[PDB]
Amino acid sequence: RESWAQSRDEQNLLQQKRIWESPLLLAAKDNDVQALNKLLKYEDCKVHQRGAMGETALHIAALYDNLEAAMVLMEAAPELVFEPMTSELYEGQTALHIAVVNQNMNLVRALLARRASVSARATGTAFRRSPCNLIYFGEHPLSFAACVNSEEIVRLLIEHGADIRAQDSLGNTVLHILILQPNKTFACQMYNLLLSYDRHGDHLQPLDLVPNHQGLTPFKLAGVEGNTVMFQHLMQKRKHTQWTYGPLTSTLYDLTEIDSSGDEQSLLELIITTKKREARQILDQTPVKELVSLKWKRYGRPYFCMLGAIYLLYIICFTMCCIYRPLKPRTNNRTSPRDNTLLQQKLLQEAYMTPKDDIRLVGELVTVIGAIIILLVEVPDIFRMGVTRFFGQTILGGPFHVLIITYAFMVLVTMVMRLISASGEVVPMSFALVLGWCNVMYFARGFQMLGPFTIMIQKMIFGDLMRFCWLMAVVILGFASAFYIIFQTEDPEELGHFYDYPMALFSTFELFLTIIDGPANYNVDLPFMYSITYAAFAIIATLLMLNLLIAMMGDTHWRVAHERDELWRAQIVATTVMLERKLPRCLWPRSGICGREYGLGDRWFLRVEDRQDL
Amino acid sequence: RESWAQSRDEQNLLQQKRIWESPLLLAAKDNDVQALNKLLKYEDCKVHQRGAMGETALHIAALYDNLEAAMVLMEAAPELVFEPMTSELYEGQTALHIAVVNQNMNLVRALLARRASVSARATGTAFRRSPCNLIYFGEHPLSFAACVNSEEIVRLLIEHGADIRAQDSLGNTVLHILILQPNKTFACQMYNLLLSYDRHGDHLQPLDLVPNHQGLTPFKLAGVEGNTVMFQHLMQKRKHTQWTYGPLTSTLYDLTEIDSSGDEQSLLELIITTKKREARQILDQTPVKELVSLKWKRYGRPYFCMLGAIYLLYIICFTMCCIYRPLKPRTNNRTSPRDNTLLQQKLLQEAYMTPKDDIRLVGELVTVIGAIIILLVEVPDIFRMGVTRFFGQTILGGPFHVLIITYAFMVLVTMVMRLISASGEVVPMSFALVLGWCNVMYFARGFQMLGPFTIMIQKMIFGDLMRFCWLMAVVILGFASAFYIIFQTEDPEELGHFYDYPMALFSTFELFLTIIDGPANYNVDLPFMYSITYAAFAIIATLLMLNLLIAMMGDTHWRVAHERDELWRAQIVATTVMLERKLPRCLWPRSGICGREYGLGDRWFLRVEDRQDL
Ligand SMILES: O=c1ccc(CN2CCN([C@H]3CC[C@@H](c4cccc(C(F)(F)F)c4)CC3)CC2)c[nH]1
Ligand SMILES: O=c1ccc(CN2CCN([C@H]3CC[C@@H](c4cccc(C(F)(F)F)c4)CC3)CC2)c[nH]1
Ligand SMILES: [Ca+2]
């Protein structure tokens, strides 16, 4: 958790004590090549002693890039280079690593010439990909050399038996490490160099078709981490051009790793299922934007709006089935205490025998069957994915996959409330209408006009109104309790705005939004400490809190106005792919033209053409 | 429609199969001039075979700019250059075209030297001016040469019999093609070169007075497409200067093609009758801004505001004629069921015999005659123009040409409702007053103060309030149905805010805008599921939806604040010209001074003078 930082830093301090109380090893921290020549020549002053992190005297000579003190330890001890560190923080790191990390060294001549091992995996905990190590350099020695942009070490290291195809404990190869580097441009140049040494290809999956232990090619990994620049360079192999015609030209894109091939994941699946921001920016690039906007124009909006009309037809025969709820006059003759009760219907229990009530038995049997169809296409998607996917990817957009569960759950209650004839049946029917109709708004994303205005709401309910509601809640029960002990010494027959304490909570909340009338009788003197504390209420309620909330809502609008126009194009892809998965193969043709008729293979293709002025 | 793209791209793939299964023709795609020399020398290996798009082996040698493979096909086949392509996509395109499109070639030496035809019209469907071809290059070979900015082909091609004055199937000449190019600056230079080769002028309409099949000169076409830069260069011939005097100077403008000459269209007519945005920017240029602002200052505002005072005097004697509507006491003695009906007048039918009611017979005969005058000056403008002109140019400004039809239509109803004495006569009179008075706002454009604030409304009613009204409509009948099944088990004598379902639709809509009081009785316990769902209503109604709508309305204001100040100057020209067309010649003098007194001709003129510091 947190004390792991408190144990890591003490290792760094403990090194400086072991570098201090050690005679030859402090001479290794400096040059001291006259003294370290003499400090070695003794009876029992062995070089295998280790500091805090389990480190030899050669490493310290390397870690402070002292070449003269390095070679004397090699000349006096030939076994010393075969020696990795043995801490739990650093582990398996040899002396070849550090001279490579310092990116400019002639010691890499010497350590290679004394037959160092170029396959020492450095799987210590200071090298795993986590947001606590500030580097991610991989494990192998040539993996470090590429990672710090030093070609002259890479060409030297590959010449003496370095294996390109060596993966890591994370599973990634040399080239996956190059994608998620922060210094993006210098990786793209040297990516071309590392690809060249793959020749003869080992007659199988040559270099950049191999997945990792998490299961991605280098091309797909460029998508998810959001490296925009490397995604440009990886399309250069994948596309190949056609005829050119003045300033007009046309190309073909490979497309074999974009759309859904089978049950395997696609790239467009991986883009929308991440929490990052830079990754979703990749949609506007030239071989993917054409694929999306063609996919939603000819097979999108028809099969979305026809899903829209069915669902609007569903609730309009649920609401019509609702308001014909059966009743009867009441038979208990104005029971528990009178004049402060008014209800007079007390729900009918089982009488359907009517030539009219048969029609509701159709309409009830419409919406209950509809509640079963909702639960059969979401509950199989809960168990197939993780449990934290629906609270998981909800920020892209996911309240609507929670509401339409709760809509189906409440309709499934009101038939259990009907089959045994309970009393309080107006509770789930009330939630059914408010949660039902607000899921019409799920279809308010396949339209340009009332599109991104929906996303502006979701980014504000889980936004400034959640921010405002707390400081609304603290004041609203502050003054209400201060109102309640004023009018408690009063008869509520006239100006009984609040007689009971769970009404002054409600009668102040209505008053805070100015949707009720403000308490006045004008006929009898309502008490004095009302009229001072009501005026002091209305200043910090109507004149301050209510319309500060429009000021910060106006300010928070334009500072996300460019982000929401990306959120919409992100949401429209996620509607397309989710619509793609459920529709069968008898509908929904695959996008783009095919092979097997043109001498291209089994892979599909897409073309596009444009003007490239000069 | 859309599958025409699905048939176009398959032609491009089918070419790559025909380039593949053809031995000499693939050798034409590369150079292969050693092999193609031998591939021709056979018995039956003729060169007239055609690929997918009906194309010969010379074209493929041209389309991949292979000069060596081009000349061997000419040397072995002299007839081969006389050969256009025969697809439906490309049609009539010869081998001279492609070497010209590639803009740098020595094959245009050779194809001309073997007597190619420089008048092969390429009227295939991949060359028509439509928003699906990314080019518009015209049809003729020198038309292509100018279009890609290569003078050295133009001077070569004009020297061997090229005809400048050759129009196209669209009707446009060489020079109309130069105006609507996208690379604007390079057209303006070479426009001067193409004008030079018109000499001897063919003693009639020399080069840039000829219209097209759509009917425009090059000067007027520069207006409508909105090419600002070419409009500067075309005024250089048209104006001619006068005396210069230090930093002060004065010029004259030609003006013979700006104002309305006769029944023919003017340029100012063509500017306001387009849907584009760049074209309406041309108004601020120096020979047109002076013409407008002088035209509206001395013959504008008088004949606009006098139209304003007549119309305000019209409705103020319609409203005065309205509220003296005749009545009587009622004679049916409180019919169909009592206490839930209140009306007590039941309109008088034909009695006008009164010394006072004669005055209304004047006032009724004022406004009915006024309704006839409205219909006699718009219905002749429907049939003379297209039917989709009033829904057509309405975005510039046109609701007011629809309302004042509907005003006249409703007043014409209420006399038919009077001549046969129907009952429900308050319906068209009510629409007459609300639609009548809102057409006073048509005159709110000839004033600086309450000017562009009108256009801010039209860009918002057909804007964010149309955006807001849908998500207002979905919630407003959501909660209302949820309110209706709560108070259905209640006697509406006390807190009968809504008893019937087409009142809870209305009583919630009033409540959503907080213009009613909020339901409270404080005396009898109104039910529990009200008070929870009312508070959850008011948060996403008064605190969220209502005042988000002011936040996005504040944000959408300043991002069109510069556009509306162009819309106003656009609207004021359209008021001037529409006022110009209807007023006779006995009024409204033509703008600017005349000829025939100064040795200038029959054309009119305008002058202006300014300072040109250094
Ligand atoms: O008695 C009750 C108690 C709670 C409620 C809850 N309603 C239901 C609808 N939304 C909820 C659920 C959906 C979610 C939401 C609403 C509107 C628009 C969006 C979005 F995402 F489209 F912006 C999301 C938040 C509150 C407002 C309150 C009604 N009635
Ligand atoms: O019972 C009804 C039913 C419909 C109506 C329609 N009115 C009529 C007037 N405008 C309409 C028509 C004009 C148009 C408009 C109004 C004001 C200002 C402008 C503009 F263009 F100047 F901004 C345009 C839109 C709604 C509001 C509603 C009234 N009464
Ligand atoms: Ca009130």
Side-chain angles (χ1 to χ4, degrees):
Chain A
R1 292 185 183 273
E2 182 64 32
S3 177
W4 185 64
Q6 185 64 40
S7 294
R8 183 178 178 181
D9 50 357
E10 293 184 355
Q11 300 291 319
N12 297 116
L13 270 300
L14 211 287
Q15 186 179 9
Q16 301 299 315
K17 188 175 182 179
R18 301 293 179 181
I19 206 65
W20 186 259
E21 63 176 359
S22 55
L24 61 93
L25 186 64
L26 193 147
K29 193 261 186 179
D30 299 334
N31 288 318
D32 290 334
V33 71
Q34 189 270 331
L36 188 61
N37 194 2
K38 285 171 89 285
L39 260 293
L40 198 279
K41 188 253 183 64
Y42 286 101
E43 184 178 2
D44 188 73
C45 289
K46 88 288 288 181
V47 302
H48 296 87
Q49 58 182 354
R50 292 186 181 94
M53 302 182 294
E55 54 185 0
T56 185
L58 182 59
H59 288 167
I60 307 300
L63 186 142
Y64 294 94
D65 67 4
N66 291 319
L67 195 153
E68 288 85 3
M71 292 177 70
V72 178
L73 269 300
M74 293 301 295
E75 183 178 358
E79 192 183 0
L80 192 62
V81 67
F82 295 95
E83 188 68 33
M85 290 186 284
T86 60
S87 73
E88 293 184 356
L89 182 60
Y90 298 87
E91 192 271 332
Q93 183 172 0
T94 185
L96 182 56
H97 283 162
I98 291 98
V100 168
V101 172
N102 287 109
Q103 84 183 1
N104 188 3
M105 207 63 207
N106 303 117
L107 178 62
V108 297
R109 299 284 186 183
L111 298 183
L112 186 276
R114 271 70 176 266
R115 293 181 292 116
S117 180
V118 298
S119 67
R121 289 193 300 272
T123 178
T125 64
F127 298 113
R128 273 82 176 274
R129 190 257 186 87
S130 297
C132 59
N133 288 317
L134 269 301
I135 63 174
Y136 179 68
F137 289 178
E139 293 175 354
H140 285 84
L142 85 162
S143 172
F144 287 0
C147 199
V148 297
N149 191 10
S150 178
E151 296 86 1
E152 295 175 351
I153 306 301
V154 175
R155 288 176 180 173
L156 195 149
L157 213 288
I158 193 58
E159 206 276 334
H160 298 94
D163 195 0
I164 299 296
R165 302 179 63 86
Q167 297 178 357
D168 284 337
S169 177
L170 192 273
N172 43 2
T173 181
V174 174
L175 278 306
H176 296 299
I177 301 167
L178 263 301
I179 301 165
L180 55 96
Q181 290 295 319
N183 192 356
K184 295 177 182 179
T185 300
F186 292 105
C188 178
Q189 175 177 0
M190 192 269 304
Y191 183 83
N192 200 0
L193 176 61
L194 258 287
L195 195 275
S196 68
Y197 290 94
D198 195 70
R199 86 287 181 275
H200 183 72
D202 292 334
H203 65 83
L204 57 41
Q205 52 176 358
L207 185 271
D208 50 355
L209 275 303
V210 55
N212 54 5
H213 284 177
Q214 202 269 120
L216 277 77
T217 66
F219 182 73
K220 288 183 181 183
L221 186 59
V224 179
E225 295 293 329
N227 204 168
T228 306
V229 180
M230 285 298 293
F231 188 76
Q232 292 292 321
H233 187 79
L234 285 177
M235 291 305 293
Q236 188 65 40
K237 184 179 179 180
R238 290 186 182 273
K239 72 179 182 180
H240 63 86
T241 182
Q242 290 294 323
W243 55 270
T244 177
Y245 182 77
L248 179 62
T249 182
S250 66
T251 54
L252 268 295
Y253 290 101
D254 196 2
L255 194 67
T256 187
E257 207 175 3
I258 306 302
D259 279 332
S260 65
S261 177
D263 57 352
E264 298 176 354
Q265 67 270 17
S266 67
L267 187 138
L268 292 179
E269 179 180 357
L270 263 297
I271 294 299
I272 58 171
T273 60
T274 187
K275 292 182 181 180
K276 294 181 178 65
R277 184 179 176 180
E278 297 179 355
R280 284 166 53 247
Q281 200 268 332
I282 204 171
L283 274 307
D284 300 335
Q285 299 297 320
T286 179
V288 177
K289 182 180 179 181
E290 296 290 328
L291 187 272
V292 167
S293 179
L294 189 144
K295 191 179 288 290
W296 190 65
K297 187 177 177 181
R298 67 178 67 248
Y299 299 118
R301 295 177 68 189
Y303 294 153
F304 183 76
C305 291
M306 291 300 107
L307 261 291
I310 291 298
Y311 184 76
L312 190 62
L313 195 277
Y314 176 76
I315 294 175
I316 203 67
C317 73
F318 174 72
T319 305
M320 193 63 70
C321 186
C322 176
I323 56 100
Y324 283 170
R325 184 258 307 277
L327 278 316
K328 67 189 287 185
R330 65 103 54 85
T331 54
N332 54 1
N333 197 1
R334 54 101 58 81
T335 323
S336 299
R338 67 189 291 273
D339 297 329
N340 212 161
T341 183
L342 212 155
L343 56 92
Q344 62 177 357
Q345 298 309 118
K346 60 181 284 290
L347 185 46
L348 187 154
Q349 62 275 18
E350 60 91 21
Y352 284 166
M353 49 98 71
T354 302
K356 295 289 288 187
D357 286 332
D358 53 356
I359 298 172
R360 294 189 294 116
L361 190 61
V362 171
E364 283 283 322
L365 265 300
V366 173
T367 180
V368 175
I369 295 299
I372 295 298
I373 301 299
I374 296 171
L375 290 176
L376 292 178
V377 297
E378 297 290 325
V379 172
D381 287 335
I382 300 170
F383 293 161
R384 188 63 62 88
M385 303 301 169
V387 290
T388 63
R389 299 281 79 79
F390 292 164
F391 293 105
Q393 61 95 31
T394 185
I395 57 170
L396 188 276
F400 292 149
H401 291 90
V402 175
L403 267 69
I404 204 163
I405 296 300
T406 305
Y407 168 71
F409 184 76
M410 289 295 174
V411 176
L412 198 275
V413 167
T414 193
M415 60 92 72
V416 180
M417 297 293 287
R418 182 65 59 83
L419 260 291
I420 62 100
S421 174
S423 295
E425 195 267 337
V426 304
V427 172
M429 294 299 290
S430 67
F431 282 97
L433 290 173
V434 58
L435 274 302
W437 281 104
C438 292
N439 274 324
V440 176
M441 197 176 291
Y442 170 71
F443 295 98
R445 66 184 64 177
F447 292 96
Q448 181 61 44
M449 188 178 291
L450 48 99
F453 177 69
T454 300
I455 297 301
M456 197 65 209
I457 295 169
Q458 179 179 354
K459 205 178 180 180
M460 191 172 286
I461 281 296
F462 296 159
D464 289 335
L465 195 144
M466 191 67 200
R467 183 176 299 168
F468 183 76
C469 184
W470 289 100
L471 297 184
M472 184 264 281
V474 176
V475 174
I476 197 62
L477 60 54
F479 282 92
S481 300
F483 277 171
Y484 180 76
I485 61 171
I486 292 173
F487 289 161
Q488 193 180 6
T489 175
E490 191 72 17
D491 192 5
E493 184 181 1
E494 290 174 350
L495 191 134
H497 277 268
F498 37 93
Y499 58 93
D500 193 1
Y501 190 78
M503 194 76 197
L505 263 295
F506 179 71
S507 181
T508 316
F509 170 72
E510 280 178 342
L511 206 151
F512 187 79
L513 277 78
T514 67
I515 63 172
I516 57 170
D517 197 70
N521 206 172
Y522 288 156
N523 203 359
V524 198
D525 51 355
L526 72 171
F528 182 75
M529 285 302 298
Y530 169 78
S531 181
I532 177 67
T533 196
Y534 180 73
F537 173 74
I539 287 174
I540 64 167
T542 303
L543 194 57
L544 182 70
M545 280 290 180
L546 183 63
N547 54 4
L548 180 64
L549 180 278
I550 65 101
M552 81 176 297
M553 189 174 291
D555 177 72
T556 193
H557 193 77
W558 64 273
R559 290 180 182 176
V560 297
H562 184 72
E563 184 175 0
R564 56 101 179 272
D565 204 358
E566 291 181 357
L567 281 162
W568 188 67
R569 296 179 184 91
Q571 197 180 15
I572 198 167
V573 175
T575 304
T576 298
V577 180
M578 180 266 176
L579 204 281
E580 192 276 333
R581 189 178 302 278
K582 306 293 174 66
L583 270 297
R585 186 63 64 194
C586 183
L587 202 34
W588 187 267
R590 290 184 63 181
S591 297
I593 209 64
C594 185
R596 297 177 69 251
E597 298 290 328
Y598 305 95
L600 292 178
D602 295 336
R603 64 187 65 248
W604 293 81
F605 284 97
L606 192 158
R607 65 179 288 271
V608 70
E609 62 187 2
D610 51 352
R611 181 185 286 267
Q612 56 176 358
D613 297 330
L614 197 278
Chain B
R1 292 185 183 273
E2 182 64 32
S3 177
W4 185 64
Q6 185 64 40
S7 294
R8 183 178 178 181
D9 50 357
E10 293 184 355
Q11 300 291 319
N12 297 116
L13 270 300
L14 211 287
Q15 186 179 10
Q16 301 299 315
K17 188 176 182 179
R18 301 293 179 181
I19 206 65
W20 186 259
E21 63 176 359
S22 55
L24 61 93
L25 186 64
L26 193 147
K29 193 261 186 179
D30 299 334
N31 288 318
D32 290 334
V33 71
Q34 189 270 331
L36 188 61
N37 194 2
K38 285 171 89 285
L39 260 293
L40 198 279
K41 188 253 183 64
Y42 286 101
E43 184 178 2
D44 188 73
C45 289
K46 88 288 288 181
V47 302
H48 296 87
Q49 58 182 354
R50 292 186 181 94
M53 302 182 294
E55 54 185 0
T56 185
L58 182 60
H59 288 167
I60 307 300
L63 186 142
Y64 294 94
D65 67 4
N66 291 319
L67 195 153
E68 288 85 3
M71 292 177 70
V72 178
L73 269 300
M74 293 301 295
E75 183 178 358
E79 192 183 0
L80 192 62
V81 67
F82 295 95
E83 188 68 33
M85 290 186 284
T86 60
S87 73
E88 293 184 356
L89 182 60
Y90 298 88
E91 192 271 332
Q93 183 172 0
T94 185
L96 182 56
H97 283 162
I98 291 98
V100 168
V101 172
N102 287 109
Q103 84 183 1
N104 188 3
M105 207 63 207
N106 303 117
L107 178 62
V108 297
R109 299 284 186 183
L111 298 183
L112 186 276
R114 272 70 176 266
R115 293 181 292 116
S117 180
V118 298
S119 67
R121 289 193 300 272
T123 178
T125 64
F127 298 113
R128 273 81 176 274
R129 190 257 186 87
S130 297
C132 59
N133 288 317
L134 269 301
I135 63 174
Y136 179 68
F137 289 178
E139 293 175 354
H140 285 84
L142 85 162
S143 172
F144 287 0
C147 199
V148 297
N149 191 10
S150 178
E151 296 86 1
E152 295 175 351
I153 306 301
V154 175
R155 288 176 180 173
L156 195 149
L157 213 288
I158 193 58
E159 206 276 334
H160 298 94
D163 195 0
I164 299 296
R165 302 179 63 86
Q167 297 178 357
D168 284 337
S169 177
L170 192 273
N172 43 2
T173 181
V174 174
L175 278 306
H176 296 299
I177 301 167
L178 263 301
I179 301 166
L180 55 96
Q181 290 295 319
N183 192 356
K184 295 177 182 179
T185 300
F186 292 105
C188 178
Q189 176 177 0
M190 192 268 304
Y191 183 83
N192 200 359
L193 176 61
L194 258 288
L195 195 275
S196 68
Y197 290 94
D198 195 70
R199 86 287 181 275
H200 183 72
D202 292 334
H203 65 83
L204 57 41
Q205 52 176 358
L207 185 271
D208 50 355
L209 275 303
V210 55
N212 54 5
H213 284 177
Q214 202 269 120
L216 277 77
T217 66
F219 182 73
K220 288 183 181 182
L221 186 59
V224 179
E225 295 293 329
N227 204 167
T228 306
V229 179
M230 285 298 293
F231 188 76
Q232 292 292 321
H233 187 79
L234 285 177
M235 291 305 293
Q236 188 65 40
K237 184 179 179 180
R238 290 186 182 273
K239 72 179 182 180
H240 63 86
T241 182
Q242 290 293 323
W243 55 270
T244 177
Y245 182 77
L248 179 62
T249 182
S250 66
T251 54
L252 268 295
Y253 290 101
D254 196 2
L255 194 67
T256 187
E257 207 175 3
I258 306 302
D259 279 332
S260 65
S261 177
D263 57 352
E264 298 176 354
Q265 67 270 17
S266 67
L267 187 138
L268 292 179
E269 179 180 357
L270 263 297
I271 294 299
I272 58 171
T273 60
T274 187
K275 292 182 181 180
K276 294 181 178 65
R277 184 179 176 180
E278 297 179 355
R280 284 166 53 247
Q281 200 268 332
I282 204 171
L283 275 307
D284 300 335
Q285 299 297 320
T286 179
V288 177
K289 182 180 179 181
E290 296 290 328
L291 187 272
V292 167
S293 179
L294 189 144
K295 191 179 288 290
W296 190 65
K297 187 177 176 181
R298 67 178 67 248
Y299 299 118
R301 295 177 68 189
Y303 294 154
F304 183 76
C305 291
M306 291 300 107
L307 261 291
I310 291 298
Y311 184 76
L312 190 62
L313 195 277
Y314 176 76
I315 294 175
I316 203 67
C317 73
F318 174 72
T319 305
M320 192 63 70
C321 186
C322 176
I323 56 100
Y324 283 170
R325 184 258 307 277
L327 278 316
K328 67 189 287 185
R330 65 103 54 85
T331 54
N332 54 1
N333 197 1
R334 54 101 58 81
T335 323
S336 299
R338 67 189 291 273
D339 297 329
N340 212 161
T341 183
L342 212 155
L343 56 92
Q344 62 177 357
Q345 298 309 118
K346 60 181 284 290
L347 185 46
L348 187 154
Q349 62 275 18
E350 60 91 21
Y352 284 166
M353 49 98 71
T354 302
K356 295 289 288 187
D357 286 332
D358 53 356
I359 298 172
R360 294 189 294 116
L361 190 61
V362 171
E364 283 283 322
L365 265 300
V366 173
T367 180
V368 175
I369 295 299
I372 295 298
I373 301 299
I374 296 171
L375 290 176
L376 292 179
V377 297
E378 297 290 325
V379 172
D381 287 335
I382 300 170
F383 292 161
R384 188 63 62 88
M385 303 301 170
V387 290
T388 63
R389 299 281 79 79
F390 292 164
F391 293 105
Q393 61 95 31
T394 185
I395 57 170
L396 188 276
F400 292 149
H401 291 90
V402 175
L403 267 69
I404 204 163
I405 296 300
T406 305
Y407 168 71
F409 184 76
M410 289 295 174
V411 176
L412 198 275
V413 167
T414 193
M415 60 92 72
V416 180
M417 297 293 287
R418 182 65 59 83
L419 260 291
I420 62 100
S421 174
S423 295
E425 194 267 337
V426 304
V427 172
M429 294 299 290
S430 67
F431 282 96
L433 290 173
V434 58
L435 274 302
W437 281 104
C438 292
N439 274 324
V440 177
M441 197 176 291
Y442 170 71
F443 295 98
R445 66 184 64 177
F447 292 96
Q448 181 61 44
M449 188 178 291
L450 48 99
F453 177 69
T454 300
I455 297 301
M456 197 65 209
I457 295 169
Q458 179 179 354
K459 205 178 180 180
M460 191 172 286
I461 281 296
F462 296 159
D464 289 335
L465 195 143
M466 191 67 200
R467 183 176 299 168
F468 183 76
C469 184
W470 289 100
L471 297 184
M472 184 264 281
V474 176
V475 174
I476 197 62
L477 60 54
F479 282 92
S481 300
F483 277 171
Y484 180 76
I485 61 171
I486 292 173
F487 289 161
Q488 193 180 6
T489 175
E490 191 72 17
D491 191 5
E493 184 181 1
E494 290 174 350
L495 191 134
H497 277 268
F498 37 92
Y499 58 93
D500 193 1
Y501 190 78
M503 194 76 197
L505 263 295
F506 179 71
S507 181
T508 316
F509 170 72
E510 280 178 342
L511 206 151
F512 187 79
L513 277 78
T514 67
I515 63 172
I516 57 170
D517 197 70
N521 206 172
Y522 288 156
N523 203 359
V524 198
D525 51 355
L526 72 171
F528 182 75
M529 285 302 298
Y530 169 78
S531 181
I532 177 67
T533 196
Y534 180 73
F537 173 74
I539 287 174
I540 64 167
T542 303
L543 194 57
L544 182 70
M545 280 290 180
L546 183 63
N547 54 4
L548 180 64
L549 180 278
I550 65 101
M552 81 176 298
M553 189 174 291
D555 178 72
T556 193
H557 193 77
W558 64 273
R559 290 180 182 176
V560 297
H562 184 72
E563 184 175 0
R564 56 101 179 272
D565 204 358
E566 291 181 357
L567 281 162
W568 188 67
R569 296 179 184 91
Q571 197 180 15
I572 198 167
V573 175
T575 304
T576 298
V577 180
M578 180 266 176
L579 204 281
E580 192 276 333
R581 189 178 302 278
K582 306 293 174 66
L583 270 297
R585 186 63 65 194
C586 183
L587 203 34
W588 187 267
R590 290 184 63 181
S591 297
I593 209 64
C594 185
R596 297 177 69 251
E597 298 290 328
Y598 305 95
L600 293 177
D602 295 336
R603 64 187 65 248
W604 293 81
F605 284 97
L606 192 158
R607 65 179 288 271
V608 70
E609 62 187 3
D610 51 352
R611 181 185 286 267
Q612 56 176 358
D613 297 330
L614 197 278

